[PDB]
Each structure stands twice: as structure tokens, then as C-alpha cells.
Amino acid sequence: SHRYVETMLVADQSMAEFHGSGLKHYLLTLFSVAARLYKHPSIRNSVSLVVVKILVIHDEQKGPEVTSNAALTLRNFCNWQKQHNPPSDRDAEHYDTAILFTRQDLCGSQTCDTLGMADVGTVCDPSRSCSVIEDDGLQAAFTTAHELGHVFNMPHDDAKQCASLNDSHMMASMLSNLDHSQPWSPCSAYMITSFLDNGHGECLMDKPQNPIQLPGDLPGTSYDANRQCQFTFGEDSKHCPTCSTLWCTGVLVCQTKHFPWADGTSCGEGKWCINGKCVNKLVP
Ligand SMILES: CNC(=O)[C@@H](NC(=O)[C@H](CC(C)C)[C@H](O)C(=O)NO)C(C)(C)C
Ligand SMILES: [Mg+2]
Ligand SMILES: [Mg+2]
Ligand code: NA
Ligand code: NA
Numbered sequence: 172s173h174r175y176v177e178t179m180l181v182a183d184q185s186m187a188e189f190h191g192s193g194l195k196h197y198l199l200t201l202f203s204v205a206a207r208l209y210k211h212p213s214i215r216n217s218v219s220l221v222v223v224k225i226l227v228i229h230d231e232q233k234g235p236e237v238t239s240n241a242a243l244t245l246r247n248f249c250n251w252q253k254q255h256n257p258p259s260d261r262d263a264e265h266y267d268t269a270i271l272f273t274r275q276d277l278c279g280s281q282t283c284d285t286l287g288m289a290d291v292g293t294v295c296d297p298s299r300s301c302s303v304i305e306d307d308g309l310q311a312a313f314t315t316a317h318e319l320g321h322v323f324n325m326p327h328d329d330a331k332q333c334a335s336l337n338d339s340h341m342m343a344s345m346l347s348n349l350d351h352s353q354p355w356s357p358c359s360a361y362m363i364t365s366f367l368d369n370g371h372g373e374c375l376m377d378k379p380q381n382p383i384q385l386p387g388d389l390p391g392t393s394y395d396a397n398r399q400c401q402f403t404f405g406e407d408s409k410h411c412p413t414c415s416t417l418w419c420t421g422v423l424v425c426q427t428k429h430f431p432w433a434d435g436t437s438c439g440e441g442k443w444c445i446n447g448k449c450v451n452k453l454v455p
């Protein structure tokens with residue numbers, strides 16, 4: 172039995188200004204990647220992330236107050252989105268979850284290293300099914316997937332409860348090398364399973380009506396190395412030096428956040444990046 176996560180994607184003025192006309196494709200590209208992660212067999216469930224609504228905030232007053240404070244930005248957001256949801260799931264534009272993208276550097280109660288935030292186990296509560304995501308380039312697709320984990324009640328993989336069952340998975344509290352063959356830990360698989368078995372995802376049973384089409388291409392087909400560097404380091408950045416770490420310009424100064432090149436990214440004629448390796452596009 173199939174879960175469809177009817178989603179609204181929302182992007183603030185910083186996003187509108189940075190991305191201009193390409194913003195909606197960018198959001199859908201981010202979400203296509205997350206949607207793929209949620210189809211991986213390791214999650215032990217059938218889960219379909221679909222978009223039913225996008226809102227861009229060209230006008231700051233028509234959005235929530237976005238600030239550097241992650242949990243307030245999230246509280247501002249989760250309240251504001253309520254007004255934008257029809258009350259029956261019968262309405263084609265009714266969403267089970269809302270996600271805010273900002274270029275604003277989000278900060279926790281210690282550092283601004285924070286890349287996103289969500290509340291835990293909220294997926295079918297319209298007043299709390301929310302997450303906020305820092306757009307630091309195409310890595311935001313993983314941030315999205317991670318925060319939607321929490322919304323599905325998965326805790327961090329280093330939490331006491333995950334000891335029996337289990338930093339190489341989606342719900343690692345810090346980024347490391349993701350185990351591309353099994354992105355979801357045994358703890359994540361069990362915790363989302365329990366949540367749904369306990370009947371907490373009843374709003375995820377109904378199919379989307381006229382959902383917004385997700386890009387079927389890999390993200391590096393849309394966005395070359397220079398473009399990815401621009402997403403992370405601003406429009407004046409471009410690619411420096413392959414596939415494992417993207418270095419970007421900033422004398423020749425280059426810099427990195429230690430992220431991989433997006434899957435699909437060209438690394439020479441007839442080759443492109445997959446799981447941080449430059450492989451042939453035609454597979455033998
Ligand atoms: C390179 N930086 C990181 O890994 C940061 N981690 C995060 O930002 C987490 C999200 C990642 C997508 C794992 C976030 O704190 C979270 O748990 N959201 O629910 C650090 C640990 C430096 C704060
Ligand atoms: Mg509305
Ligand atoms: Mg030089
Ligand atoms: Na941040
Ligand atoms: Na930061």
C-alpha cells in the first residue's frame with residue numbers, strides 16, 4: 172500500500188531574487204532527488220513524494236518572517252502555511268506537508284552551520300507538518316530528504332533508541348559519506364514503519380490529482396559544474412580544479428563545502444558523475 176506525500180514547496184524573496192526565472196525548475200530538481208531517495212528499497216515502505224503546490228514569495232509581506240534563527244523561521248513558517256491549505260484532502264491543492272527554501276543562512280542555538288530544521292512525527296498534522304531548508308546549492312536535496320525524515324518520525328541515527336537496530340545514512344546528524352547502496356539505516360526503516368503501522372500517516376493514502384511534473388533527468392543534466400558552484404558560493408563563483416568533491420573559485424583561490432558533484436554532471440566527453448565517480452554514460 173502506497174503513501175503519497177502531497178507537498179507544497181515554498182521559496183522566499185531571497186530565493187526569487189537569486190534564482191530569477193529558473194527558481195521553479197530548481198525547486199523541482201531538488202525535490203526530484205529527494206523523491207528518488209524515498210523510493211530506495213532500504214526505507215522498507217512505498218513512499219511517493221509529489222508536488223501539488225508551489226508558492227514563490229516575490230513580496231516579503233505575503234510570506235512568513237524569515238530570519239537567521241532556524242526554529243523561529245520554522246515556527247513563523249509553520250503558522251503562515253496553515254492559511255494556504257484547504258481543509259479537506261479532497262481538494263487537489265491540499266498538502267500533507269510544506270517545505271520552505273531560503274538562501275538565508277540558518278542558525279541553531281550554537282552555530283550557523285545548520286542546514287535545515289523540522290519537527291518530529293508531524294506528517295499528517297496540518298499545523299505542524301513543516302520543515303525549512305537552507306539553499307546551499309544542490310545539497311539542499313539531501314537536507315530536504317533528511318528533514319522529511321523527522322517529519323516521518325525518524326530520529327538521528329546516533330540516538331539511544333537506534334543502537335540495537337544500527338555515519339553513512341540519511342539521518343546522520345552530520346554529513347559524512349552516504350552509503351549509496353543503503354541510504355536509510357535500520358533505525359530509520361523501523362521508525363517510519365512503526366509510525367505508519369500505528370496509523371499516523373492516514374492522510375498519505377490518497378492519490379494526488381494533477382501533481383506537478385518532476386524532472387526525470389539527473390540534476391547534473393540541468394546544472395553543470397559552474398552552475399553548482401554558483402548555487403553554493405554565489406554567482407561569481409565557477410568551477411575550479413573529480414565527481415567526489417566540488418571545488419569552486421573565490422590569486423587563484425578555490426574553496427569547497429566538501430560536497431560531491433551532482434549525479435549527471437559532465438566530467439569529460441561521454442562521461443559524467445554518479446555516486447562521486449566519473450563513469451561512462453553508456454554502461455557495459
Ligand atoms: C556540514 N554541516 C552539518 O552536517 C550540520 N548538520 C545539520 O545541519 C543537520 C542537517 C543535515 C542535513 C544532517 C541539522 O542540524 C539537522 O539535524 N536538521 O534536522 C552540522 C552538524 C554542522 C550542524
Ligand atoms: Mg493560497
Ligand atoms: Mg592563479
Ligand atoms: Na546555516
Ligand atoms: Na553557515
Ligand code: NA
Nearest residue numbers: 326342358359
Ligand atoms: Na534514524
Ligand code: NI
Nearest residue numbers: 231236237238
Ligand atoms: Ni523582516
Ligand code: NI
Nearest residue numbers: 337339356357
Ligand atoms: Ni549502517
Ligand code: NI
Nearest residue numbers: 188189406407
Ligand atoms: Ni546577478
Ligand code: NI
Nearest residue numbers: 405406407408
Ligand atoms: Ni557578477
Ligand code: NI
Nearest residue numbers: 396397410411
Ligand atoms: Ni569544469
Ligand code: NI
Nearest residue numbers: 426427428429
Ligand atoms: Ni572545509
Ligand code: NI
Nearest residue numbers: 348349446447
Ligand atoms: Ni558518496
Ligand SMILES: [Zn+2]
Nearest residue numbers: 317321327344
Ligand atoms: Zn536532523
